Each structure stands twice: as C-alpha cells, then as structure tokens.
A paper describes a structure:
PLLs are natural lactonases endowed with promiscuous phosphotriesterase activity. The catalytic center contained two metal cations coordinated by four histidines, an aspartic acid and a carboxylated lysine residue. A structural analysis of [name], a hyperthermostable counterpart of the PLL family from [name], has revealed that loop 7 is shorter in [name] than in PTEs; linking the active site to the loop 8, which forms a hydrophobic channel that accommodates AHLs aliphatic chain. Indeed, W263 is located at the start of loop 8, involved in the dimer interface of the enzyme and positions the lactone cycle of the substrate onto the bi-metallic catalytic center.
Noteworthy, subtle changes, such as W263L or [name], yield to a large tradeoff in catalytic activities. However, whereas detergent-induced flexibility has no effect on the lactonase activity, we isolated variants of W263 that exhibit increased lactonase activities (W263T/V/I). These variants exhibit dramatic improvement of their oxo-lactonase catalytic efficiencies (148-fold for variant W263T), while the activity for the best AHL substrate is compromised (3-oxo-C10 AHL; for the wild-type enzyme). Conversely, the LacSV group dramatically increases oxo-lactonase activity and 3-oxo-C12 AHLase activities, while the phosphotriesterase activity is mildly modulated and 3-oxo-C10 AHLase is decreased. The residues selected in the LacSV group (T, V, I) are overall smaller than those selected in the PteSV group (F, L, M) with the exception of isoleucine (I). The analysis of the normalized B-factors of the variants clearly reveal that the substitution W263 is destabilizing (as confirmed by the Tm of the variants), but also that the active site loops of PteSV are significantly more disordered than those of LacSV. PteSV lose their activity before the loss of the global structure (Tm), whereas LacSV do not, and exhibit a similar thermophilicity profile to that of the wild-type enzyme.
Residue numbers in the entry:
A (entry chain C), B (entry chain A): 1 to 314
Write the structure that this text describes.
C-alpha cells in the first residue's frame, strides 16, 4: 500500500528489497513504431526482456524500476507480460522525455495540463489500465534547460507535491543540466531526497557529482556498461572514490540497460566498441566484486541497493 | 493506374478530377496519443472527418490529398474507415514531418535508410496494409534547414527519383525555407514540376512566391481560413494578383483543414480569434466566388483544382 507495481498489489517501501533503480525493458520511438511497424519484432523484444529480468533475479534482484515514459515508448501491457513471465517487482513511471521541444500537442497548454497527465497516471492508471505510476521521469541533455524542458520539470514538481512520488531524471553529465534540474525542482518545493539526478556516472568530475549530493539528492551512477559515455574502469574508480569520501547514502547504481532499443547507435556491429559488456547484470559480474576487493564493506552494498531505494520511495 | 488511393484501386491521373491538394482528416502527436489515450475520442474524430468530407463532396470535390505523415499521426486504418463512410478518393502519403531533430531512432542512420522507409510505404504499403503512398511529405519551419531537416529532404529526393511520386512540403513563408527546400531537391535531381512548396499563401510577398514558381514548382496557397497566418482577404488579393500575373499554371489552393487536431492552439475557444471561417469548404464559400466576380473564369478555376493536381501526379 505505497509503491504501485505493474501487475501486482502495491507494496510497502520497506519491502522493495535489492533494487535496480534504472533499467529499460524496451525503448522505442513512438512515432517511428506507429508509422513503420515492419521495423520491429515484438517476439524478440519479449524474449530479450524476459531473459534479462530472469538473470537479474538469479543474482538476487527483487525490484526493477523502469523509467521508460513518453518519448521512450512506454507500454504498460508489454510490461505486464514481462512481469507475468518472471514474477519481478516492476515499478513503472510517468513523465516526458524530451531534449528540446514538447510534442505539438502541448502548444498553448499550461504546466498544469502537463502535470495533470502525470497525476492521471499516478492516481488513475497508465494507458487505460489500473497499473499506476510510482514516480515521474524527466530529461534534459546537450541542448540544456530549454523552455519546454523547464515546463516539464515544473510539471513533475507539481505531481510530486500532489502525490508524493519521487522524481528520476536523465541529465547530461557535462553541461550542468543535472544541477539545474535539482535547483528548479527544489525551488518548486520538491524535497531534495525525492530526486535522483541521472547519468552523473557518465563523468569522472567528482566535484560536480558531489555538488548534487551535497544539496540532498541521490546521484545516478547509473549507466554501467555504456563505455561510450564513460568506461567501466573509470566509473568504478569514481564510484569507489565517492564511497570513500562518505557519499554511499546518496549513491544509486544501475545500468540503464535496454533489453531492446531501436536507435541506430545500438546496431550489433557497434556493441564491441561502444558497450561490449553492457547488460542488466554487469554490476554483479564486475562492479560489486570490484568494490568488495577494494575495501568496501557489505553494509555499503546494502545501503546503495536496498536502503537508498527504500528511502527514495518512502 | 498510377495514383494509389486509400481503400480503392489506383487511378490514372487524368481521372483525379476536382482535388483538394492539402487537407487533414485527423492530426495528432503519436507519442501523446499512445501514452494518454484518455485525451482522445475516436468516435468524435471519425464523425468530424466524415461530415467535412461529405460536405466537400457535395460541393464537387472528387479527390483529397492528405499529407498527414510521421509526426502528424498518420493512421491508414482511420483513413480507410473514412473512405468507406464517404466514397472519397483519398491519396495518402509517406514522409517525415519535423522542425528540428529526427526521432532518436534515426541516431546514426543514413539518409538511405530514411529513404527506404518512404520507398517501403510507396511500393509495399502503409502500416502493414496494402494501401500505398502516392507522394512524400517533408517539412521545415521557423528553425530553418537544420541538419536533420536537410536529411529528410534528401531522403525525399531519393524516394522521388526511385518511384517518381511527387513531393509536398510544409514550409515557413517568412524565412526562405520553401526556396531552400526547392533548391536542395532540384540540386539532388528532382524535377521542379514534381514539387509543391507549401504554405506560401501565408505571405503576401509575391516576389518571393514568384521566385519559387519561376523555378518550376507548384506554389501552395494552401491555408485558406487560417487567419492567424494570413487573413482570407489578403490571401485572396495575393491569389488574384498571381493569377493576373499569369501564374495559374503553378498555383495550388487548399485549406490545410484538420477535421480534428489535438494541439492546444486549436481549443474551440480560440477558433473565433485564430481561424473563424476555417473549414474544408471555405474556398467554395469565399475564395472561388471572390475570384469569379473579379473576372477570373471557370477555366482558371479548372486549371488550379483539376489540371495542376493532374500534372503534379503525372
Ligand atoms: Co537517460
Ligand atoms: Co504544413
Ligand atoms: Fe534510461
Ligand atoms: Fe498540413
């Protein structure tokens, strides 16, 4: 009776268990898939998602939070089927993922109208189902905090204030967008501890990363495996340094893995150089063992993957 | 047989008859409708489109060309439903409607891959049906010819050269985008006579409009009713001037009417202010009568609404 789950009764936050806070069962461009269905294979997508979730569960993952929202091809019914086939705790979200402008629908519509969409998903349910959103996802990237990006951020703040769900962000680690997202959300009255500023693991600039944590928000070291953003070894070094400097209670770790994704960058022939070891279980194979043999106590692991998510959703 | 029609056998261009070259049965943002179905009412959308098309047919319209493509919510099955209900000849298109960047799908994809999508729709069919595209639609607006906009234009050229279908554009009448579209397409080897440069009726700058006509392309005086872009009377004066100057061989006229559109700008409360007399039959009620009492004969009306679309699709 707190965190809504796809295809299940809602759960208390104290019962979330070991959590992967940022993974995607499937990502696609809504307009492309609608216009050219021949490009997609739902059987393969389902197979890939089920296989990955099953392996995560074998490593002890109890809950997966999937920030696929408008602009990334959120499909609650696809998510339902994956849950059915695996028994995973899956937290679905609402929100809008844009880099520049909103869809034309939003021309001459207020921030209130946008927030209403989020509240609908949180209180009523997603895409005509009774599966409810457990959080709001927003984005900004290379283009910075544009007018429309800002509208979406302020709409997310309204939704959090009304429903108490936390906010997960996508940011670009190199241009201050994460710090700006946090600033705007907190100014709108969002509790800093209800914000996860995403993709900060894409940089080794620990001074910037600590600024965000210092202002009270979780920091997303959340793209493990995506070497094109930052290699695994450098991520590991950065994660280890943050832990040693006392930032464990702010750290969240994940892969941002896409069991299937439709962008051209994700073509199989680019995998070897861009993301050779990227999968939903890389941290069990590399990161966690690495931390443990570099003096990191098990209590820190519990904090990052259990306590922090519990707090985020409380 | 030459021009494919939705839900009908293809027709020869000589049988196209009185044509509205740019009208929309329904426009929506794909991602918004997919994520928040509660905002839409397909019954109402269907009724609106059927009612408008029936009135157009009563006034002698034989064929409607509907350039709703990716980015505007093309839905071939909705189009089929309207054809069945009305008996209209409906030409559907392929293409991409963007102002700034392509959907993320297109990250690291070639211009050829884009063209392949268009060729698929033209040669195989649209959205898994046997209804084929009869033209390619591209756009550019206030942001100008961005890198991604330019890719789409060049993709349209490949599609035209390969399949001979014509190209219809959306442009901004005030920033030279129409002229640039024409230049890029012709430089790629597209026959200027297979291009309609759209939304030129949004300006009363006849020197600009004539520049495009002189270069061999049709000029889209195609937003009659949309006063916020240019009021009916000034459009009429511009149209009449171009006709008196001898340009009826390049003129195409339409409303760009949307029987339903989901953008906030089109909320009913704004209609009286922005587009009070906008509908799919305005040119029958105002424009054509206006031209006639200004000495324009039935032959010129025939050239614009029958002969020009015939040539365009030949
Ligand atoms: Co992201
Ligand atoms: Co247009
Ligand atoms: Fe993500
Ligand atoms: Fe249009």
């Amino acid at each position: 009776m707190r965190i809504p789950l796809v295809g299940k009764d809602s759960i208390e936050s104290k019962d979330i268990g070991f959590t992967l806070i940022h993974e995607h069962l499937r990502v696609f461009s809504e307009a492309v898939r609608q216009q050219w269905p021949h490009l997609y294979n739902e059987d393969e997508e389902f197979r890939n998602a089920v296989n990955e979730v099953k392996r995560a569960m074998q490593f002890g993952v109890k809950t997966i939070v999937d920030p696929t929202v408008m602009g990334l091809g959120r499909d609650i019914r696809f998510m339902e089927k994956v849950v059915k086939a695996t028994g995973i705790n899956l937290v679905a979200g609402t929100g809008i993922y844009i880099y520049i402008d909103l869809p034309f629908y939003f021309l001459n519509r207020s921030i209130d109208e946008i927030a209403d969409l989020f509240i609908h998903d949180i209180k009523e349910g997603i895409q005509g189902t009774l599966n409810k959103a457990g959080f709001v996802k927003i984005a900004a990237d290379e283009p910075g905090i544009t007018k429309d990006v800002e509208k979406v951020i302020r709409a997310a703040a309204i939704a959090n204030k009304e429903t108490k769900v936390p906010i997960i962000t996508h940011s670009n680690a190199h241009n201050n967008t994460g710090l700006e997202q946090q600033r705007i959300l907190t100014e709108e009255g969002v509790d800093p501890g209800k914000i996860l500023i995403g993709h900060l693991g894409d940089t080794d600039n620990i001074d910037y990363i600590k600024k965000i944590a210092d202002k009270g928000s979780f920091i997303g070291l959340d793209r493990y495996g995506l070497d094109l953003f930052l290699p695994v070894d450098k991520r590991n070094e950065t994660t280890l340094r943050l832990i040693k400097d006392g930032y464990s209670d702010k750290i969240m770790i994940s892969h941002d893995y896409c069991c299937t994704i439709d962008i051209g960058t994700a073509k199989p022939e680019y995998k070897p150089k861009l993301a050779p070891r990227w999968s939903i279980t890389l941290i069990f194979e590399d990161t966690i063992p690495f931390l443990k043999r570099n003096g990191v106590n098990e209590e820190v692991i519990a904090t990052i993957f259990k306590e922090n998510p519990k707090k985020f959703f409380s």
